[PDB]
Design a binder for these strands. Structure first.
Lengths: 98, 84, 95, 76, 106, 97, 81, 106, 95
DNA sequence: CGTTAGGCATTAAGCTGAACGCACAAAGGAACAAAATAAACAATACCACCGAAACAAAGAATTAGAATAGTATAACGCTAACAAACATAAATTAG
DNA sequence: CTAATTTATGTTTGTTAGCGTTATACTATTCTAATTCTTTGTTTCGGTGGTATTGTTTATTTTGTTCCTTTGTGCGTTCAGCTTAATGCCTAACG
């Protein structure tokens, strides 16, 4: 009989260790591929510096972490913990995004 | 060196979205969060990348520096510290 | 013998009579249009100034204005404004 | 007891004219009568208004006699 | 015979005044001659886009004057003018009349 | 007697005040409030009437923006009303706290 | 003549919320909205006071309120540039 | 013998470089001589306030280096530096570790 | 024989050795401090420029910088910075 | 890279008459506002559930790292030549 | 209703594209290492629906309470033309 944790118990330890640690959480090569995929449509054959893709990854992680903080605020406000896409759309709507 | 790219929004994966969510303090994440967050990321990258491309195309240049990404994030009001 | 308020009040009315001959305009709406013209002028000239600084250019030419128009104005407004602008400099240079 | 400012030619002229209009227009709002009186007041000539002007001037001099050291001090 | 720079471009906004405002506005040391012509062009087109929608709003309301309620209506009803003027509020303008569908009865 | 249903008069006032462009704050109490707060920063501060009109107009705009965001947050939480937690959330998400 | 945050009356806040499209307002909203308006005017008034104090003017013109509202991201149209 | 303008004010930041950046930054035509001294003063005081809280954070963590996690901690824990740098995000900084009290178990 | 990056890297270290002698600093944190110094310089100089324009002043003196410091920096940071600044100009004028 | 000694030409402090801006006299219902109340509908407390998300182990498949070579490109310096500021005479226009 | 504000012409000058070169980081390739993404099988728990109590908002009427729009007069505030010292920018020199 193996030992199993409960849903949420491991989640708090993961929240703590990811709030403590400062690294990037999405890999650099799919972000390079996605940035070069998107920037085709504005001008083809662009060279991306590694520092430019790293700066885009830093600002991307910062924007998504702030948006998920506001999503958790809105989901807590509606007496939920499981965030939902309407919370994302609401937190974008209040923020002045759309 | 000619190549076209496709379907790179699946490269930002679902247990790599869950880490960005659990950094922000989220305790439970629903199933339909992922495509919406990828779309949010897509429109944000499209705005900031279009700004960086106009910045580098004004300068008669062919590559994208990090300084132009910093200026593009400055014009959206999200200033980045650490690149000059 | 009061000093005169330098404003864009006549030219908004000229544009209005070009585009809508029958309808009149208020005075406070003319003030709103004056404030809007000054706001958009500050936005475009500020982006042109910081673009000339980022490229170490001491001269703001029409390229910086065109890039700033493509920066600020979203959607089809950008390319419509650029077509209007290039029509204006081709008119100004052909004469 | 605070001292009130001397009534100006229009206020003096309205005190008696305002009542005249109220008796003829006792259901008319003061807000509207005040507007018609101003319209009518602007149509009086200086010679006709002069009598009103001199009385306000006399009320001001007489008011100054009762309260010579009085000063107009508005609240900012 | 000499013709003005505002009608050299075939416009209404004065090229000389926007040139003077670019000079004394302290944006650069020099300014190109195509810059005020381009800027007057985009400005004239922009208030043309405002006044056309304002006139259609005022003619749609069976009025003959442009009051700022018409300017607020013409700006808030649009999509790509709403992104340009999203933070700016309008004096004596009111709001765009829209009520959430859950507040309304069935 | 025939009293209206609760909210039907509120709906008619919603459509009336949204169709209206009038100032919903009386000028004298707002003048008193502005000259009551601004004494704390500096004394002997008279105001132009256009300045207090601008302050009333901008506070009107800021409050109707705050209240449409508040009603968004309240509808989101399955509530027709407004509670002050909605105002707290709408000020927090906008980044004003 | 003191305590002028009750100058912003309770019907004049119900009208502000009816303009915003609000069907019901609870009774605990008026004091919170009064505090919100108070801190908003505190910010804008402090900025306009620093403006008119830098120019050594004892009065607060309209342009100072425009410039104070511009810096918080809420530009006023109509009161001159 | 002549002494530098940075230590004329008794500071570390160079008065000449901030004077040159105010000149070539195109902010006005002229600039007063008290302007770079005042600006170097407020700048030096500002990074003194940053580095003091950063050193107290790094000494509080039993580290001997200032990594940007310490800068993000020193900025986000403060009140009146958080209003100055609220929109700015920090490279490799992470977040301020704080968890909402309803997510935590009893 | 590369051209040199003009930056504030030495003076942040001088301030750090004045305020904290034992702890060292990274290189990327020094770049962050350089970017922060340039950001705050742009904020203060932009507010000083627009204040000199709003009063039709062609000269930015220390009054505009003091007013801009009181504008941007919130709380006790404002008066602390003003006291530091006035200490600096009294030092610079006494010598 | 940074500081310092003399012109000079621009610029803010100083000053006064003049023009602006605001409060306030009466009026007297109109329009607003506070207060008390009936009750009706909205917030909320509680309960069931079920399917949806978390947890785990395995493997796959992907990224990381490194050496390296080409290699487009970007960042250095001369140079012309071109475009814009500046000094000085109309004109139309407009508050 | 005529001063004033834009427009045109020639001159200087200082900015910038063209050119050359070269360095330099970028892109691609091919290996191992490692690490982490995706599949599949538990498992357990939170969003959502449904009902009942309650608590509090609304709409209304009564009774105060204020307001509002009108012109002239008093007083404090600002502003613009004119004086005048302050000062900052340029050049030459030095370190």
């Amino acid at each position: 009989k193996p030992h199993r944790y409960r849903p949420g118990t491991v989640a708090l330890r993961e929240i703590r260790r990811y709030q403590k640690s400062t690294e990037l959480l999405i890999r650099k090569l799919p972000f390079q591929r996605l940035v070069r995929e998107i920037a085709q449509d504005f001008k083809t054959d662009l060279r991306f510096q590694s520092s430019a893709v790293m700066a885009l990854q830093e600002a991307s992680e910062a924007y998504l972490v702030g948006l998920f903080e506001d999503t958790n605020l809105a989901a807590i406000h509606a007496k939920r913990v499981t965030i939902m896409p309407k919370d994302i759309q609401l937190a974008r709507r209040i923020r002045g995004e759309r | 060196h000619r190549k076209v790219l496709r379907d790179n929004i699946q490269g930002i994966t679902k247990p790599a979205i869950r880490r960005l969510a659990r950094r922000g303090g989220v305790k439970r994440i629903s199933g339909l969060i992922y495509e919406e967050t990828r779309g949010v990321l897509k429109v944000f990258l499209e705005n900031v990348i279009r700004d960086a491309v106009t910045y580098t195309e004004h300068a008669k240049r062919k590559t994208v520096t990090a300084m132009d990404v910093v200026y593009a994030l400055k014009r959206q009001g999200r200033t980045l510290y650490g690149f000059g | 013998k009061r000093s005169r308020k330098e404003s864009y009040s006549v030219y908004v009315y000229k544009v209005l009579k070009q585009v809508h001959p029958d309808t009149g305009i208020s005075s406070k709406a003319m003030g709103i249009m004056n404030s809007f013209v000054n706001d958009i002028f500050e936005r475009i000239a500020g982006e042109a100034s910081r673009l000339a600084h980022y490229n170490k250019r001491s001269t703001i030419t029409s390229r910086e204005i065109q890039t700033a128009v493509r920066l600020l104005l979203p959607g089809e407004l950008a390319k419509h404004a650029v077509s209007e602008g290039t029509k204006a400099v081709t008119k100004y240079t052909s004469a | 007891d605070r001292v009130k400012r001397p009534m100006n030619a229009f206020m003096v002229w309205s005190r008696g004219q305002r009542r005249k209009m109220a008796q003829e227009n006792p259901k008319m709002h003061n807000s509207e009568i005040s507007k018609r009186l101003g319209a009518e007041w602007k149509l009086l000539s200086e010679t006709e208004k002069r009598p009103f002007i001199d009385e306000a001037k006399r009320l001001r001099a007489l008011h100054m006699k009762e309260h010579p050291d009085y000063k107009y001090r508005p609240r900012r | 015979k000499a013709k003005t720079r505002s009608s050299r471009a075939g416009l209404q906004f004065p090229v000389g005044r926007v040139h003077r405002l670019l000079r004394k506005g302290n944006y650069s040391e020099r300014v190109g001659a195509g810059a005020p012509v381009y800027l007057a062009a985009v400005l004239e087109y922009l208030t043309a886009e405002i006044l056309e929608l304002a006139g259609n709003a005022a003619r749609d309301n069976k009025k003959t004057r442009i009051i700022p309620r018409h300017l607020q209506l013409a700006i808030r009803n649009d999509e790509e003018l709403n992104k340009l003027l999203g933070r700016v509020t309008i004096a004596q303008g009111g709001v765009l009349p829209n009520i959430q569908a859950v507040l309304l009865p069935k």
